[PDB]
Amino acid sequence: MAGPLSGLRVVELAGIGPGPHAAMILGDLGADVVRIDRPSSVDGISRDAMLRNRRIVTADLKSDQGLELALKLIAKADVLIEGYRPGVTERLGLGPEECAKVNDRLIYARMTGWGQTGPRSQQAGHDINYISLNGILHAIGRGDERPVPPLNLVGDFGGGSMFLLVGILAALWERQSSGKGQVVDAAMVDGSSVLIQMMWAMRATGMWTDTRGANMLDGGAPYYDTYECADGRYVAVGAIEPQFYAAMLAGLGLDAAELPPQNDRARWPELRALLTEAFASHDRDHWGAVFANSDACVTPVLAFGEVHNEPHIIERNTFYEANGGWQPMPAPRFSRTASSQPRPPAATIDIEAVLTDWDG
Amino acid sequence: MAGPLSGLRVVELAGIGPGPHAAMILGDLGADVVRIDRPSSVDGISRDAMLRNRRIVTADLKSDQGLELALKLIAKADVLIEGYRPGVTERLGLGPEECAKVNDRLIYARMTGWGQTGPRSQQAGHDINYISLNGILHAIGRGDERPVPPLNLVGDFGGGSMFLLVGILAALWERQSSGKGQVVDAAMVDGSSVLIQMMWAMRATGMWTDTRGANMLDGGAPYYDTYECADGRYVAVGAIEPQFYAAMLAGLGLDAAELPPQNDRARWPELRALLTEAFASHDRDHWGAVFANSDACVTPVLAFGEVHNEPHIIERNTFYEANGGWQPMPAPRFSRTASSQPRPPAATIDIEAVLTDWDG
Ligand SMILES: CCCC(=O)SCCNC(=O)CCNC(=O)[C@H](O)C(C)(C)COP(=O)(O)OP(=O)(O)OC[C@H]1O[C@@H](n2cnc3c(N)ncnc32)[C@H](O)[C@@H]1OP(=O)(O)O
Ligand SMILES: CCCC(=O)SCCNC(=O)CCNC(=O)[C@H](O)C(C)(C)COP(=O)(O)OP(=O)(O)OC[C@H]1O[C@@H](n2cnc3c(N)ncnc32)[C@H](O)[C@@H]1OP(=O)(O)O
């Protein structure tokens, strides 16, 4: 199996959102990932490409046989991933204490939203709920409108799965010293708060307000925002540093002498009006050509459907084709032990067959 | 130093955005992190709390001595982080090969936006630019308006720092088996694409469209969006599963038989108007109480300045007081080798002191 995590053995108690995304990435990087779903499920081969780089098995964990077969897998594995409410694995007999008794090298990885304790620990939730409580959702969107969810990118994945991964991998480094596994408690409400640590830092030094749409990085700055072009499509501008901003102005055809200062916030309305009129005078693909190879920090805002035609995306092989649809290649990249293309979702496998393969 | 990464040694060449965030998380989890800045930028004790859990040393890397001293650090370290454009470390004589001569065990970690090669590889950029090229930015915001940046959470942090971290820690694992370091190439355009793999999967199965504001998780669904309340503050609704959705309607006082089906998308505008009126008739705190302990997936949308008063936040100690204000505690959490509270940014120390501390 190709990639730096070759040899790593992972058991995933099937769930939704972050836990499968973490499991996918370990698979992506060469880990041997075995996914236990319930049998009331899997109608053949999955169409869900997030379940790539997996072996799927089924098992009623409520039954005695199911539980015993699960515990045999966990006994021979490096990592367990579960993302059910706190208490579910305990009551099923697969809690950390029970797993510790059959394999004290195990990394026991618990993926939740609210965490393992506290008043909300049993409420159902999704990404939008977890980022609503820690101040993040309130900060996203235009000032004159209600907050808008940044898909499920910030809570599920960026503040969820990715912190789960860092915990798993940090714990595996620690196990090199101690010879011992441990519990990783990854909560989306905590992870996402660390993801936005910058804003908490800037807020302490008066460089970030709670007012939505009135900061440097939320769309409030005329030089960090999107602009509509002549054709109704968009470019993005990210010209924070004065030398990049000057390059953008020159490319737009505006003399610095006619505009207000870049960071005179009281004249941002005027500046936005000027940039708006200038970007609106040609189409997105015009601006893309003008600004290619420049430090102006102006790029076209591509729709998913157009991404496959962008030279820089093509050349670095950011995507691969699979089942009438492009998919992202593994990230990040490794000089010596490169990842390979992902394997598609396979037909279910028998759980004894895995135990035998794992040397049993 | 508490945490699973006790005894990991990390040299950070000072940059902006993702590299410092990764370095911070390594520190947070107990790595020994030494940050090399240039003498011209360091003034008093640094007031950017993203520079917590570091030792700061200055060193003109363009000088012969600065270079020599830095190669002596790298010699004694496990990981090097650099976030400059490609070519930059090479010309300093700190490139991956100069480093492999003094330490073939080093994990050489390169944090860029566009990658190591390809047509955009020397282009300046920020978060908003990296996410504009791969479909992500186009998908964020309301449909009748231009895309809005989700702060810098998706490119720098979620698809940036976090993948550098997964790469550093996966390579340390590969290394335990091979004796050898390697180069980790973390490109924000790649990481952020993997971060949004769920949407690529969903597009292939016809379950996601390129139309902004017309999807389950982008704000188009009336049951996954924010609503304004009687006091002008907001709640978030994330009631995807029908049972949770049903529980939400009952608490709004709405008879499910009077409403269009949850997932009849042609009638979503109509459903939204009914839910809008319901949520508008009481204030945020009313709804927060009404739905406490519920599975209705309705949560108050708090501003940063209110987060310190939320019981679930207080009781799990997601934050600690510092400096000007609250900052997020390390994530994720570990049962045996637990992180400790972050050490503030300390004063600059001399690079010889450090080399004493690390031996040769
Ligand atoms: C769709 C995008 C996702 C997002 O945006 S992230 C949102 C999801 N949130 C999380 O994942 C955080 C933690 N998880 C949760 O809060 C809950 O799992 C979630 C998602 C609310 C779903 O709630 P429920 O459906 O109530 O599930 P739960 O966690 O309370 O318990 C799971 C039930 O499944 C059972 N189970 C799981 N694997 C099984 C197996 N192989 N065989 C037999 N039974 C199995 C388990 O026994 C439990 O059922 P029960 O309570 O015992 O009736
Ligand atoms: C504010 C929010 C941030 C976001 O939203 S993320 C966006 C940032 N993008 C990235 O970090 C991607 C990779 N980095 C870059 O593209 C560039 O570094 C970036 C951010 C465009 C800035 O470009 P430049 O300022 O041109 O910097 P550069 O990386 O090209 O090279 C800088 C020069 O600094 C020099 N330098 C660094 N540390 C030094 C030291 N200790 N002593 C002496 N010289 C030192 C280094 O030699 C380099 O080269 P040179 O002077 O052109 O040869």
Tell me, letter by letter, the H, E, C secondary structure of chain A.
CCCCCCCCEEEEECCCCHHHHHHHHHHHCCCEEEEEECCCCCCCCCCCHHHCCCEEEECCCCCHHHHHHHHHHHHCCCEEEECCCCCHHHHHCCCHHHHHHHCCCCEEEEEECCCCCCCCCCCCCCHHHHHHHCCCHHHCCCCCCCCCCCCCHHHHHHHHHHHHHHHHHHHHHHHHHHCCCEEEEEEHHHHHHHHCHHHHHHHHCCCCCCCCCCCCCCCCCCCEEEEECCCCCEEEEECCCHHHHHHHHHHHCCCHHHCCCCCCHHHHHHHHHHHHHHHCCCCHHHHHHHHCCCCCCEEECCCHHHHHHCHHHHHCCCEEECCCCEEECCCCEECCCCCCCCCCCCCCCCHHHHHHHCCC
In terms of Cα–Cα distance, which of A248, A230, A233 is closest to A302?
A: A233
How many CA atoms are closer than 13 Å to the CA of B191, on its beta-carbon side?
A: 35
Q: Can you tell me the distance from the alpha carbon of A279 to that of A221, in angstroms, rounded to the nearest whole number?
A: 15
CB contact under 8 A, B114 and A224: no
Q: Are B55 and B33 in contact (CB under 8 A)?
A: yes
* Whether residue B160 has its Cβ less than 6 Å from ligand 2: no
Q: Are A224 and A217 in contact (CB under 8 A)?
A: yes
The set of residues, in sequence order, having a beta carbon less than 8 Å from that of B342 and lying 6+ positions away, is: B27, B28, B52, B53, B320, B322, B327, B329, B330
Residues linked to residue A328 through DSSP beta bridges, in sequence order: A319
The experimental method is: X-ray
Q: Which residue of B has its CA nearest to A141?
A: B148
3-state secondary structure of B224: strand
Q: Which helix (H) or strand (E) holds B300?
A: strand B298-300
Q: Can you tell me the distance from the alpha carbon of B127 to that of B21, in angstroms, rounded to the nearest whole number?
A: 14
Is B104 designated active site? no
Q: How far is the CA of A86 from the centre of ligand 1 (A)?
A: 10
Q: How far is the CA of B82 from the centre of ligand 2 (A)?
A: 9
Instruction: Supply φ then ψ for residue A326, to 5 degrees.
Output: -75, 155
Query: Which CB contacts under 8 angstroms, 24+ apart, belong to A287-295?
Result: A287/A229, A287/A235, A288/A235, A290/A251, A291/A248, A291/A251, A292/B119, A293/B119, A293/B122, A293/B123, A294/A247, A294/A251, A294/B123, A295/A243, A295/A244, A295/A247, A295/B123, A295/B124
Q: How far is the CA of B138 from the centre of ligand 2 (A)?
A: 27
* Whether residue A275 has its Cβ less than 6 Å from ligand 1: no
Q: Which amino acid is at A187?
A: A
In terms of Cα–Cα distance, which of A80, A33, A28 is closest to A57?
A: A33
3-state secondary structure of B172: helix
How many CA atoms are closer than 13 Å to the CA of A152, on its beta-carbon side?
A: 23
CB contact under 8 A, A182 and B336: yes
Q: Can you tell me the distance from the alpha carbon of A320 to that of A330, in angstroms, rounded to the nearest whole number?
A: 10
Q: Can you tell me the distance from the alpha carbon of B167 to that of B79, in angstroms, rounded to the nearest whole number?
A: 11
Going by CA atoms, what residue is nearest to atom 45 of ligand 2? Answer: B61
Q: Which amino acid is at A39?
A: P
How many Cβ pairs within 8 Å bridge chains A and B? Answer: 503
* Domain positions in chain B: 9-195+330-358, 224-312
CATH number listed for the domain at residues B9-195+330-358: 3.40.50.10540
Q: Can you tell me the distance from the alpha carbon of B248 to that of B299, in angstroms, rounded to the nearest whole number?
A: 11
CA distances from A263 to A140, A275, B129 (A): 21, 14, 20
Q: Are A242 and A248 in contact (CB under 8 A)?
A: no
CB contact under 8 A, A137 and B301: yes
Q: Which fold has domain B224-312?
A: formyl-coa transferase, domain 3 (3.30.1540)
Q: Residue with structure tokens 């190439």? A: B185
Q: Can you tell me the distance from the alpha carbon of A169 to that of B26, in angstroms, rounded to the nearest whole number?
A: 12
As to burial, measured by CB atoms within 10 angstroms (0-12 exposed, 13-18 middle, 19+ buried), residue B197 is buried
Handedness of CA A17, A191, B244, B274 (dihedral sign): negative
DSSP letters along B246-299, please?
HHHHHHHT--GGGS--TT-GGGHHHHHHHHHHHHHTS-HHHHHHHTTT-SS-EE
The set of residues, in sequence order, having a beta carbon less than 8 Å from that of B77 and lying 6+ positions away, is: B9, B10, B11, B34, B103, B106, B358
Ligand nearest to the CA of A37: 1
In terms of Cα–Cα distance, which of B351, B3, B19, B195 is closest to A158?
A: B195
- Cα first-last separation, chain B: 21
Q: Can you tell me the distance from the alpha carbon of B157 to that of B159, in angstroms, rounded to the nearest whole number?
A: 6
CB contact under 8 A, B331 and A118: no
Strands (E), B1-131: 9-13, 32-37, 55-58, 79-82, 107-112
In terms of Cα–Cα distance, which of B348, B301, B80, B319 is closest to A212?
A: B301
Q: Which amino acid is at A62?
A: K
Q: Which residue of A has its CA nearest to B174?
A: A4
Going by CA atoms, what residue is nearest to atom 52 of ligand 2? Answer: B88
Q: Are A213 and A219 in contact (CB under 8 A)?
A: yes
* Whether residue A251 has its Cβ less than 6 Å from ligand 1: no
Q: Are A294 and A252 in contact (CB under 8 A)?
A: no
Can you list the alpha helix ranges (DSSP code H) found in B86-226?
88-91, 96-102, 127-133, 162-178, 188-195, 197-204
As to burial, measured by CB atoms within 10 angstroms (0-12 exposed, 13-18 middle, 19+ buried), residue B173 is buried
The angle at the Cα of A307, spanning A306 to A308, to the nearest 5 degrees, equals 95
Distance from CA of A280 to the nearest CA of B (A): 13
Q: Can you tell me the distance from the alpha carbon of B228 to that of B218, in angstroms, rounded to the nearest whole number?
A: 17
Q: Can you tell me the distance from the alpha carbon of B145 to that of B307, in angstroms, rounded to the nearest whole number?
A: 30
Q: Can you tell me the distance from the alpha carbon of B152 to that of A229, in angstroms, rounded to the nearest whole number?
A: 23
- Dihedral over alpha carbons B66, B72, B75, B81 (to 10 degrees): -30
As to burial, measured by CB atoms within 10 angstroms (0-12 exposed, 13-18 middle, 19+ buried), residue A98 is middle
Nearest to A163 among B154, B204, B332 (CB): B332
Residues linked to residue A293 through DSSP beta bridges, in sequence order: none
Q: Can you tell me the distance from the alpha carbon of B162 to that of B156, in angstroms, rounded to the nearest whole number?
A: 9
* Whether residue B59 has its Cβ less than 6 Å from ligand 2: yes
Q: How far is the CA of B269 from the centre of ligand 2 (A)?
A: 47
CB contact under 8 A, B153 and A195: yes
3-state secondary structure of B79: strand
CB contact under 8 A, B319 and A193: yes
Ligand nearest to the CA of A189: 1
Q: Are B141 and A141 in contact (CB under 8 A)?
A: yes
Q: Can you tell me the distance from the alpha carbon of B103 to that of B358, in angstroms, rounded to the nearest whole number?
A: 15
3-state secondary structure of B148: coil
Q: Which residue of B has its CA nearest to A206?
A: B324
Q: How far is the CA of B124 from the centre of ligand 2 (A)?
A: 9
Residues of B in contact with A143 (CB under 8 A): none
Distance from CA of A145 to the nearest CA of B (A): 9
Domains A9-195+335-357 and A224-312 in one fold: no
Nearest to A297 among B124, B136, B141 (CB): B124
CB contact under 8 A, A148 and B153: no
* Whether residue B126 has its Cβ less than 6 Å from ligand 2: yes
Residues of B in contact with A170 (CB under 8 A): 3-5, 29, 169, 334
Nearest to A293 among B123, B164, B305 (CB): B123
Q: Are A170 and B4 in contact (CB under 8 A)?
A: yes
Q: Residue with structure tokens 């440097």? A: A216
Summarize the annotated binding site of B for substrate as residue ranges: 38, 59-62, 83-85, 91, 125-130
User: Hey, how many other C-beta atoms are within 10 angstroms of the C-beta on A1?
Assistant: 15
Q: Which amino acid is at B177?
A: S
Residues of A in contact with B204 (CB under 8 A): 47, 49, 322-325, 327
3-state secondary structure of B144: coil
* Plot region of A64 (φ>0 → left; ψ -120 to 50 → alpha; else → beta): alpha
Ligand nearest to the CA of B14: 2
Structure tokens at B212: 């902004």
Structure tokens at A80: 């367990």
Structure tokens at B215: 């999807």
Distance from CA of A108 to the nearest CA of B (A): 10
Q: Are B155 and B61 in contact (CB under 8 A)?
A: no
Please state the separation of Cα A268 from the chain's center in Å: 33
Q: Which amino acid is at B95?
A: G
In terms of Cα–Cα distance, which of B27, B35, B33 is closest to B342?
A: B27
Structure tokens at A321: 């084709």
Q: Can you tell me the distance from the alpha carbon of B71 to that of B79, in angstroms, rounded to the nearest whole number?
A: 12
Tell me the pairing of strands B79-82 and B107-112: parallel
The catalytic position among B156, B190, B218, B225 is B156
In terms of Cα–Cα distance, which of A175, A163, A157 is closest to A79?
A: A175
Please state the separation of Cα B288 from the chain's center in Å: 28
The CATH architecture to which A9-195+335-357 belongs is 3-Layer(aba) Sandwich (3.40)
In terms of Cα–Cα distance, which of B209, B230, B206 is closest to B218?
A: B209
Residues of A in contact with B306 (CB under 8 A): 135
Q: Can you tell me the distance from the alpha carbon of A224 to that of A313, in angstroms, rounded to the nearest whole number?
A: 23
Q: Can you tell me the distance from the alpha carbon of A129 to that of A127, in angstroms, rounded to the nearest whole number?
A: 5
Is B126 designated active site? yes
Residues of A in contact with B16 (CB under 8 A): none
- Cα first-last separation, chain A: 20
Instruction: Supply φ then ψ for residue B125, to 5 degrees.
Output: -170, 165
- Dihedral over alpha carbons A268, A274, A280, A286 (to 10 degrees): -100
* Plot region of B136 (φ>0 → left; ψ -120 to 50 → alpha; else → beta): alpha
Angle between helices A162-178 and B162-178 (to 10 degrees): 30
Q: Residue with structure tokens 């204490």? A: A97
Q: Are B197 and A328 in contact (CB under 8 A)?
A: yes
Q: Can you tell me the distance from the alpha carbon of B298 to that of B236, in angstroms, rounded to the nearest whole number?
A: 5
Q: Can you tell me the distance from the alpha carbon of A187 to that of A19, in angstroms, rounded to the nearest whole number?
A: 11
Q: Can you tell me the distance from the alpha carbon of B228 to that of A72, in angstroms, rounded to the nearest whole number?
A: 51
Q: Are B207 and B217 in contact (CB under 8 A)?
A: no
CB contact under 8 A, B118 and A316: yes
Residues of A in contact with B198 (CB under 8 A): 21, 50, 152, 156-157
